[PDB]
Curated annotation (Swiss-Prot):
Summary of subunit composition and partner proteins: The RNAP catalytic core consists of 2 alpha, 1 beta, 1 beta' and 1 omega subunit. When a sigma factor is associated with the core the holoenzyme is formed, which can initiate transcription.
Natural source organism: Thermus aquaticus
Signal peptide: none
Family: Belongs to the RNA polymerase beta' chain family.
Residues of the full protein shown: 212 to 421 of 1524
Protein name, entry field: DNA-directed RNA polymerase subunit beta'
Its biological purpose: DNA-dependent RNA polymerase catalyzes the transcription of DNA into RNA using the four ribonucleoside triphosphates as substrates.
Source taxon at top rank: Bacteria
Length: 210
């Protein structure tokens, strides 16, 4: 198991009398408290992909292969289109019915927004969580500890074969599920930070420096 962190820049718009002004939004923070429903209007064209983030959704607009326009529709704003559709300038995307929160683990930190007389153009730095399971077959070796920070590119499972190798995606904490066996040792453990003066298998007593 490796729980990865995803970060996307995207856009949303709403009526001023519905927004609540802030700098960021916690894994649940109320974004908008809607009195009358809203139909988010498509402001560019292109082929659409949708993203399920548990409660809230994320749309991209693609043209050819390269992406063109990204849109954010929070929890409580259910979508009206599906993956594949071709959609035009002024078409409803989703409906903002009730209370617009941010999913129970998904966040939208440092957001830069601009005012537009009757509406707001918000753009939203979005963190979140999505894990991906990896097999460990007999002739293998996991090469970094569990509950451990990991970066974009550093090896995770070494092997004799390059296709068998495991390179990390992006920022994401590492885990590991169901072992083949459990080793259990009458051993006392001692975390350390820097230099050691003790080799493995050393005969060591109480009051002995490690």
């Amino acid at each position: 198991r490796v729980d990865y962190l995803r970060k996307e820049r995207a856009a949303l718009r709403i009526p001023l009398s519905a927004w609540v002004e802030k700098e960021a939004y916690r894994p649940g923070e109320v974004l908008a408290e809607l009195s009358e429903p809203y139909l988010f209007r498509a402001e560019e064209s292109g082929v659409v992909e949708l993203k399920d983030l548990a409660e809230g959704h994320l749309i991209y607009l693609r043209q050819e292969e390269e992406v063109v326009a990204r849109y954010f529709l929070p929890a409580g704003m259910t979508p009206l289109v599906v993956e594949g559709e071709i959609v035009e300038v002024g078409q409803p995307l989703a409906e903002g019915k009730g209370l617009l929160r941010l999913p129970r683990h998904m966040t939208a930190k440092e957001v830069e927004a601009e005012e537009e007389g009757d509406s707001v153009h918000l753009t939203l730095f979005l963190e979140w969580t999505e894990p991906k399971d990896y097999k460990v077959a007999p002739h293998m070796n996991v090469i970094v500890p569990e509950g451990a920070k990991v970066q974009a590119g550093e090896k995770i499972v070494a092997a004799i074969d390059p296709e068998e190798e495991v390179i990390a995606e992006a920022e994401g904490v590492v885990h590991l599920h169901e072992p083949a066996s459990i080793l259990v040792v009458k051993a006392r453990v001692y975390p350390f930070e820097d230099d050691v003066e003790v080799t493995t298998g050393d005969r060591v007593a109480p009051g002995d420096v490690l």
